[PDB]
Amino acid sequence: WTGIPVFKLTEAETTRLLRMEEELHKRIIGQEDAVKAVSKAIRRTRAGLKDPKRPSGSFIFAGPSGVGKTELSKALANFLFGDDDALIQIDMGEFHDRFTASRLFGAPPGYVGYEEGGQLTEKVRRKPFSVVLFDEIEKAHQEIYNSLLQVLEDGRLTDGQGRTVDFKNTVLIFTSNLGTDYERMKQKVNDELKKHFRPEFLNRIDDIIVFHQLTREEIIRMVDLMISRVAGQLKSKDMALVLTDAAKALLAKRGFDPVLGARPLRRTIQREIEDQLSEKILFEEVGPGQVVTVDVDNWDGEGPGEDAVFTFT
Amino acid sequence: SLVLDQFGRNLTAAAMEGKLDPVIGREKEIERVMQVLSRRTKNNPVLIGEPGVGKTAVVEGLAQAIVHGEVPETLKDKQLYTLDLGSLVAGSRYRGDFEERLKKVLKEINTRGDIILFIDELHTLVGAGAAEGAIDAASILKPKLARGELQTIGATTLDEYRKYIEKDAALERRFQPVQVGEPTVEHTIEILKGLRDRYEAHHRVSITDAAMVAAATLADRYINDRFLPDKAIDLIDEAGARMRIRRMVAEVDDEQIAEVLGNWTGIPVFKLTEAETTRLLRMEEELHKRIIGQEDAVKAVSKAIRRTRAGLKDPKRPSGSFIFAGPSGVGKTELSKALANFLFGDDDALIQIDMGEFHDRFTASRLFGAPPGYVGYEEGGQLTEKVRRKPFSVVLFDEIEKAHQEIYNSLLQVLEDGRLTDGQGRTVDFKNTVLIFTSNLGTERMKQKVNDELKKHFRPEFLNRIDDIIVFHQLTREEIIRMVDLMISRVAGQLKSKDMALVLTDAAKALLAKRGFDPVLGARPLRRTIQREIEDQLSEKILFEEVGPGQVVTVDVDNWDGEGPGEDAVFTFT
Amino acid sequence: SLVLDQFGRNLTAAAMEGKLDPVIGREKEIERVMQVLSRRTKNNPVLIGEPGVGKTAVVEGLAQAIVHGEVPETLKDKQLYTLDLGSLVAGSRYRGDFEERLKKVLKEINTRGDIILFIDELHTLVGAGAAEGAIDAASILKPKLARGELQTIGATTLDEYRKYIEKDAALERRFQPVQVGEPTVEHTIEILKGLRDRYE
Ligand SMILES: Nc1ncnc2c1ncn2[C@@H]1O[C@H](COP(=O)(O)OP(=O)(O)O)[C@@H](O)[C@H]1O
């Protein structure tokens, strides 16, 4: 009826629940603490040992830019529901105007758009079990958090129409960017969160998670992850892509930076792999029925490699 | 059976001749309706769903299951009748007529005992003979539905359930929701493979498996206002209609589906033609017809559009996101205008938004509209509506420095996820647009200065979300000579409309270039030089009737050696 | 035709005597309209455009094409009737009269089968007669429009499409948009050369 997975735990489901850290790390390379906390929350919810009044979980993800904060929420939604559109993504970048908070709950009676109702409330009512992600919460004013103070503590939200919406079964994930070697970064982020947000709002959340920076090993694994997308894209055109280990190491070499996140690696793959591959595809250098073995020429693998060339066969 | 035929239609007898389309992949939802209809009291299911997910298809599949014999004993040999409330209301001038018709219908159902009733658009039940506060269809059906003597299957949209049914909490009580969710891509492919025979027979065409895979994938990916499997079936049906029109055995492949999608949405999803391929490989030159110099920026935009047109673009991100940062007059707006001219043929298709108007915190609501309960809520946003008009467009943000940070923080979601939500609640997709941000900031040393200024005036999130940051370089003498040539060419093109031709010697162009160079150039100066020394003197002469229409004018120079400053040189219009 | 004449106007018979202006350069839009009208399910096109760009002009050109017989075999010898929704709701004074007239019109269309409806201001279907005890024309037409047993061509402004039809997604599903854009300068000159004979 309600779509809430309250059943007897089958053996396959139980084994998948014990292994959810591995299944989340299938997509999220690194970020062990956040995956751990999300795993404990979901196991607590599915064990039946959960406080009925409070929601299933309430986290705030903080740290540098491009370290999987939205990716972890998307991966959690992909685990729970099987596809990423089931994630209720409501973004606080649209709420710089204090007047826009009505979009969360609705217009009061006697005003235009009263019959339609809110955006968050109706989407939560349609799917009582969902992962609700508030992106970039630092950007909205402190008024919008006052509407969420009730759902963080008692799991109820009153819309304009007067009906009560239950947030008891939803996982609420905030993603902020305050603050931006690990321990001082964690302390700075926690102090920034204390300064920016009221303590009465930071007490109602289950966990404050600081995302660690990306280093060489997780960036060289992300090389594999984000070239898998291009490989799957080429599989639709009767084409296959393979990288030599030199290609993987060179892509990881030009895409690693600690003062930024994971996006320069995507730019390196877009400019060094996808652009020349697109040029070769349109010039019919390689087409359907052929594989592309991308290699590195004029390089040794140890130096920085300012002059290595990507070769396509 | 003599009463229910007038006010309804027999769905089981419709499935007797196979007039109902086959229903594929709805085993769970049909079984849910079966196991709700088998209750003791209040055995009424309502198929709550989205427009075009197969809510009526579930009922037709149940009718096909009934006529086949797969059903259990409680639903065996049960005729399924869809009720036309408009046929009940019609012709009832007197209250006795309408209520007596409805009670004859109920009496026939209760007498025969083997009619399941189907109400498509159940929200028409709340007020049929009168308002919600009097005797109508709902007020007569409620006592029967509550005690469970009448088996009624409602069908209702999610929004119509929220709006009309949910206000009447009595009918909400008497119907259990059965969510008919949106089928996935593989489910849509299986559904399309189910409906090959009917469309092949009607269209007299042949449809391939790759055609249906492409139809489902493209309908899921590109169309963003409808729900599967309706849009994939729309593409298949319209391609079949195209083939039937074109012949008077056909073959429908992925190319016809892509062409139908291109007609529908304007997104150029096509198998690339030879002429268009040779255009795209050399389109740096076709850009360089207008834009002069700036090889890095032209090359970057060329790579982005080439990646987009060859199917190597990330489906969750826009086609490209660019920061054209540099000094004024270099051509930051001109490259975007030339790109719009290349992509669409006209410069008015460039969705241009000036950020000078967004210089105060209140104007951020212009882009995505007003929240509910405020003025301007119905009209919606200015940018979201413009992009919803055409999914494939070049969106320019002019003089990006003038705006305040709230617009940037609103457009971060556009830059990364390729989506924008208006105050109306709709989601508009920017995944097919080319987003350009022009900036005049920081003015190899220019690269560092511009990068540092953009670091200072922006948050790291906005600079991470941007694909390419291109610092436009200053103009040089050769390309400003080419600039002068281009301005003279356009002035001559304007002049041919008045039956006149214009030409300059090399000396006049060289003098214009010598009087038009400094580190602030472009057309902000040296178009004033054309406006002062060429255009204005020509206007004075034509208005004086000298060198009038019909005579070619040759602009020469006097009192100049061709090397000196030329401050004493005079333009002569022979 | 005894009942549909009282509520609509024939455009094929109008093009028989040439009371419709010639249509120049709209071969693509007319081809797209004949494309959508040739489908099996959801064969209802809606001409979406700016006010004054020729929405009714496209349909008049379609009627001229039908009477000239250059249309395909699926649209050969089919009468294009515009439906005057004001005249449908005109003499009712009651509650069951409008639904009776609409049902009778649909019965005549189904028993003839060679009639294509045309609705100026398609957005007027929602609330096309809505009393305390009445069901509007949209809910009557939707079961026929969904399966494809009724072929209707709508004409709608972009603002009217956004404000009204987009607010009713069930009705918006049944209609395939056909975007009639503003003609270019050369297209306008061609249209002017076409209409020059009539204006002289
Ligand atoms: N640990 C990770 N594993 C896989 N991908 C990652 C990881 N961290 C970041 N990414 C990449 O970063 C992008 C998401 O970054 P995001 O979490 O949205 O950063 P922010 O929230 O600061 O904008 C995704 O495209 C993803 O590919």
Ligand SMILES: Nc1ncnc2c1ncn2[C@@H]1O[C@H](COP(=O)(O)OP(=O)(O)O)[C@@H](O)[C@H]1O
């Ligand atoms: N399982 C299925 N098998 C075959 N066709 C389907 C299936 N589901 C949906 N369709 C097609 O999609 C359309 C569904 O329309 P429907 O969702 O009933 O409209 P509404 O939402 O207005 O009730 C029908 O035309 C039907 O042909």
Ligand SMILES: Nc1ncnc2c1ncn2[C@@H]1O[C@H](COP(=O)(O)OP(=O)(O)O)[C@@H](O)[C@H]1O
């Ligand atoms: N490289 C170029 N190619 C063609 N026209 C140019 C070029 N550079 C400048 N222009 C001229 O400059 C004008 C646009 O300058 P623009 O770059 O928009 O100024 P700003 O840098 O202040 O935005 C146009 O009218 C165009 O004629």
Ligand SMILES: Nc1ncnc2c1ncn2[C@@H]1O[C@H](COP(=O)(O)OP(=O)(O)O)[C@@H](O)[C@H]1O
């Ligand atoms: N292709 C064409 N040939 C001739 N006239 C045209 C053409 N397109 C538009 N028109 C003119 O446009 C007008 C039709 O505008 P119309 O679309 O009916 O307005 P609205 O959209 O407000 O209903 C007519 O006067 C007609 O003369």
